[PDB]
Amino acid sequence: AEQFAVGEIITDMAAAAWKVGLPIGQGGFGCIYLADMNSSESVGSDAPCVVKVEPSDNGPLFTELKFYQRAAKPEQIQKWIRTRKLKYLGVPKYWGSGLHDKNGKSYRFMIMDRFGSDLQKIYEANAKRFSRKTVLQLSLRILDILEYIHEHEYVHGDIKASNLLLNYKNPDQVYLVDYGLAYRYCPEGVHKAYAADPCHDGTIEFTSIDAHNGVAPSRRGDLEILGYCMIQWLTGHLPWEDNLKDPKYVRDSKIRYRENIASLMDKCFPAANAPGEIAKYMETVKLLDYTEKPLYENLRDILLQGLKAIGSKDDGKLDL
Numbered sequence: 001a002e003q004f005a006v007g008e009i010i011t012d013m014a015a016a017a018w019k020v021g022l023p024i025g026q027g028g029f030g031c032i033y034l035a036d037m038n039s040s041e042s043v044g045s046d047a048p049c050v051v052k053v054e055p056s057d058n059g060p061l062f063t064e065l066k067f068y069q070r071a072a073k074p075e076q077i078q079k080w081i082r083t084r085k086l087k088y089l090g091v092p093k094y095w096g097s098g099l100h101d102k103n104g105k106s107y108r109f110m111i112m113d114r115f116g117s118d119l120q121k122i123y124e125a126n127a128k129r130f131s132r133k134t135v136l137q138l139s140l141r142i143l144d145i146l147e148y149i150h151e152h153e154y155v156h157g158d159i160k161a162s163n164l165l166l167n168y169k170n171p172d173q174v175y176l177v178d179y180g181l182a183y184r185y186c187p188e189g190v191h192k193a194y195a196a197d198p199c200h201d202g203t204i205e206f207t208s209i210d211a212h213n214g215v216a217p218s219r220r221g222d223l224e225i226l227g228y229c230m231i232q233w234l235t236g237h238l239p240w241e242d243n244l245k246d247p248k249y250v251r252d253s254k255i256r257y258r259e260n261i262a263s264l265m266d267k268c269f270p271a272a273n274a275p276g277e278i279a280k281y282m283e284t285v286k287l288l289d290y291t292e293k294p295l296y297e298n299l300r301d302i303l304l305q306g307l308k309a310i311g312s313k314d315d316g317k318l319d320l
């Protein structure tokens with residue numbers, strides 16, 4: 001159903017003017033439309049923005065909007081890129097938000113960057129494998145994103161290929177989306193206690209042991225989720241993938257494989273052929289306490305030794 005008239009001009013809270021175009025991806029992702037700056041020209045298929053629209057009473061869009069307003073300000077992101085000497089940062093840029101009435105109902109809208117394909121479509125097109133080169137290059141950039149959001153008091157809790165999108169104009173740049181169930185683990189620098197939060201489940205195959213135990217996600221959980229993603233991307237499989245309707249089984253399997261990472265490597269890889277950097281990554285994440293700040297540069301260094309081992313380097317090429 002129609003939130004906007006096609007081609008309509010909408011003004012955000014900061015009085016910036018935008019034009020609304022057609023819904024994205026045959027309406028497969030819900031109420032998300034192409035958007036551009038207000039101009040005499042119609043919004044084309046090459047629009048640089050999207051507008052997401054939900055009823056004002058939608059909890060997830062409010063959570064997401066708050067994350068975006070607090071940590072995705074364009075200048076704020078650019079400053080981080082400059083000061084950390086990054087090529088880019090995969091955190092979508094926030095362009096504005098407002099309230100829009102239609103048919104006597106109140107809607108919230110948010111203007112964000114427009115990306116290309118999600119990684120899950122590309123993964124499936126590649127018979128559910130990424131090369132070691134691709135996985136190490138993806139994971140280095142996701143460690144940059146996680147360090148960023150963690151340093152801005154948030155954890156994502158749901159890293160996966162469907163939440164990773166390529167830059168529309170650059171296929172070597174990957175961005176992490178979906179902050180609707182993101183968790184502010186450290187409001188004003190005070191870490192949440194090890195307990196439930198009045199609900200961040202995550203995706204069952206990739207979620208953290210912390211999440212399965214019913215506690216609020218923290219930084220170690222995000223790094224654990226990326227670990228499971230890396231194995232899924234390399235091998236096409238996870239050991240517990242046939243028992244995804246039994247959370248108890250999934251949690252039990254993850255707990256057992258955390259206690260014995262050698263047995264996880266033996267299970268997931270051909271005998272005697274497991275990538276050492278994946279094992280070292282999981283061993284390092286296992287050592288994190290619930291409230292502990294990760295050493296993100298140590299984790300990047302572990303993955304860089306992986307690139308050295310295959311005769312490569314971090315040249316920012318995702319090889320997709």
Ligand SMILES: C#CCN1C(=O)[C@@H](C)N(CC2CC2)c2nc(Nc3cc(F)c(O)c(F)c3)ncc21
Pocket residue numbers: 024025029032050092093112113114115116117118162163165177178179
């Ligand atoms: C056209 C086109 C391509 N395209 C898709 O095919 C699918 C994968 N999606 C939807 C995303 C959710 C999976 C897209 N999302 C966005 N922007 C965007 C979405 C967000 F959710 C968000 O928070 C944000 F900051 C920006 N641009 C383009 C697409």
